[PDB]
């Protein structure tokens, strides 16, 4: 089946500009209180999530160097320690991963 | 078109002719070439016709300007501010006389469709018709099927 | 201009407190209506021929077999009355129809999810909001005061009822499932044509008649099952055992009414009128009412002697 007649621009504008075709305004955008960048209410802040991932990647690279090969997952818990810190009483018997930087303020030692 | 063009109602300029008639043509500006063939008829109109036409119309200031031009033109200006330009290219002397006389007699209003061939500010002397014009009145202005003094 | 919901701004401490608070108010409001006859009831008129009483709203619990004393097996559907109350009365004059109407509601729902206009309606009534509201055509002598609770014992074994509910929704369906068309053969050369409508009209009219059966949305519409016999009533749990199956999925809400079939006209002479008032009832009803022909669970095994 083929078109019997060319569709006019008048007809086409009605189809293309029908409210159903238009982009809807989003009402769920808000400011992230921690960083001030924008976020959606139900979604994690992109700026804060990236910050966490970047530190997570650095720690994982350190874990790699300590393991030094595939199939070397430890059978004990792990703790991340930053410059100027020492193992606590509850950190004894745990693999220590040492980061050459100051503990981020948002990374509370537990 | 009528639909594809503007229109207006029949009218006059300052109620012309009511108290006195005032010729609306106010100025005529001719542009004739000394040597152009297309101005031959315009040159003959300036030699024998324009002077006698000016005597008859002392309220119209005529400006004849001889200068090089390929298309001689007459520009008519009216009291209401309308400006009309009419080419006299290759026109005969009699043709130009006819055109100039027509310009003298026109009011200067736009030559467009006139909705009505008449105009009046007092269309009614006895009272314009309304739905009660020919209706009788009833005692106490009672409406149809209206109980009085209930 | 951004939308909000009830607990959006509530703190960790206030969310449990608010839930408990509104829950307790809901329960208290339902308990305050348990004595309709001590709270200025409307006149209780006697049943007369031609009288139409109110129906109920119930939830469809499921299905169950029962056996009759003649040995025959009848499957039945359990319908539980869950927080059924009269909501509004509209007089015959203002109804726009031939009869008066009485609005009934069923099943308590969260107030945090209802429109403001509905909430203020229920606030004046003093009841928690209901999921479904239905309109029952009644005669003037059967009017009941808004806020009166309705119970399963409104119906009695041996009665016949009509049950209306939304059918199960099957979405967009082809002609074979929707209309029972035969389709076309599976082999002998059929080309990409097995479940299709075929011809939809004649060539002459050069159009398709209104009402022509075609693929489209199936189910999810109101249907009514007529002439269902009430086999049993459990007064403790407020469950009505109706013969056969009723439209809708399990846990849907159904509209239960006295059967309008001509054979069952004027059989309400012995039925509660305008309704059953358990508080008014002099002698408490047994936990189960049975139709005379039903084999009760504790009855001796059938013997054909």
């Amino acid at each position: 089946a083929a078109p019997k007649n060319r569709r006019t621009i008048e007809v086409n504008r009605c189809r293309r500009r029908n409210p159903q075709k238009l982009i809807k305004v989003k009402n769920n955008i808000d400011v992230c209180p921690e960083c001030g960048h924008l976020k959606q209410k139900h979604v994690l802040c992109a700026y804060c999530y990236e910050k966490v991932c970047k530190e997570t990647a650095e720690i994982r690279r350190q874990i790699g160097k300590q393991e030094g090969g595939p199939f070397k997952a430890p059978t004990i818990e792990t703790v991340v320690l930053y410059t100027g810190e020492t193992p606590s009483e509850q950190d004894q018997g745990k693999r220590i991963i040492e980061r050459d930087r100051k503990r981020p303020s948002w990374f509370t030692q537990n | 078109t009528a639909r594809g063009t503007p229109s207006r109602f029949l009218a006059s300029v300052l109620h012309n002719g009511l108290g006195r008639y005032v010729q609306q043509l106010q100025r005529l500006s001719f542009s004739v070439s000394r040597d152009g063939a297309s101005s031959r008829g315009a040159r003959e109109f300036v030699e024998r016709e324009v002077i006698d036409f000016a005597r008859r119309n002392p309220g119209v200031v005529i400006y004849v300007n001889s200068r090089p031009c390929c298309v001689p033109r007459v520009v008519a200006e009216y009291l209401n501010g309308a400006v009309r330009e009419e080419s006299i290219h290759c026109k005969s002397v009699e043709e130009i006389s006819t055109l100039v006389q027509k310009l003298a007699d026109q009011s200067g209003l736009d030559v467009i469709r006139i909705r009505k061939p008449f105009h009046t500010d007092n269309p009614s002397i006895q009272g314009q018709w309304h739905p009660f014009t020919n209706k009788p009145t009833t005692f106490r202005g009672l409406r149809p099927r209206e109980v009085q003094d209930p | 201009k951004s939308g909000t919901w009830w607990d959006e701004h509530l703190s960790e401490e206030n969310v449990p407190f608010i839930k408990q608070l509104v829950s307790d108010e809901d329960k208290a409001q339902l308990a305050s209506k348990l004595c309709p006859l001590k709270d200025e009831p409307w006149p209780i008129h006697p049943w007369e021929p031609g009288s139409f009483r109110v129906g109920l709203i119930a939830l469809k619990l499921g299905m169950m077999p029962l056996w009759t004393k003649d040995g025959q097996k009848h499957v039945v559907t359990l319908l539980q009355v869950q927080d059924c109350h009269v909501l509004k009365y509209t007089s015959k004059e203002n109804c726009n129809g031939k009869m008066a109407t009485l609005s009934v509601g069923g099943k308590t729902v969260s107030r945090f999810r209802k429109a403001t206009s509905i909430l203020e309606f229920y606030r004046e009534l003093g009841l928690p909001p209901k999921q479904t509201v239905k309109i029952f055509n009644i005669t003037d002598n059967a009017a009941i005061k808004p806020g009166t609770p309705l119970y399963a014992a409104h119906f009695r074994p041996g009665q016949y009822v009509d049950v209306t509910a939304k059918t199960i929704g099957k979405g967009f369906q082809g002609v074979m499932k929707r209309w029972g068309f035969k389709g076309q053969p599976a082999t002998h050369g059929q080309t990409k044509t097995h479940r299709r409508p075929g011809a939809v009209a004649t060539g002459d009219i050069g159009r398709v008649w209104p009402g022509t059966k075609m693929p489209g949305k199936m189910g999810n519409i109101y249907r009514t099952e007529y002439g269902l016999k009430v086999w049993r009533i459990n007064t403790k749990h407020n469950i009505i055992y109706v013969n056969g199956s009723v439209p809708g999925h399990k846990n849907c809400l159904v509209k239960v009414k006295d059967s309008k079939l001509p054979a069952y006209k004027d059989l309400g002479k012995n039925l509660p009128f305008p309704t059953y008032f358990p508080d008014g009832d002099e002698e408490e009803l047994p936990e189960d009412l049975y139709d005379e022909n039903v084999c009760q669970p504790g009855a001796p095994s059938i013997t054909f002697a």
Binding site: - | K135, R143, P144, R145, E146 | -
Partner: protein, 59 residues
């Protein structure tokens, strides 16, 4: 649009608002003929008796 200006009522009752805006009643197009029981004795007496029935006819 014209049909919106037409107000049909099956009986003599007309809503009060409609009654208050009425201006003129139009004459009925058909003259309603009088039933025989509606004629006054003057009218009946004015119409002549056209024939003399036999005195011995049972009728």
């Amino acid at each position: 649009t014209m049909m919106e200006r037409l107000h049909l009522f099956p009986d003599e009752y007309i809503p009060e608002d409609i009654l208050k805006n009425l201006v003129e009643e139009l004459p009925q197009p058909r003259k309603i003929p009088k039933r025989l029981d509606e004629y006054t004795q003057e009218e009946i007496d004015a119409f002549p008796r056209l024939w003399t029935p036999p005195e011995d006819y049972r009728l």
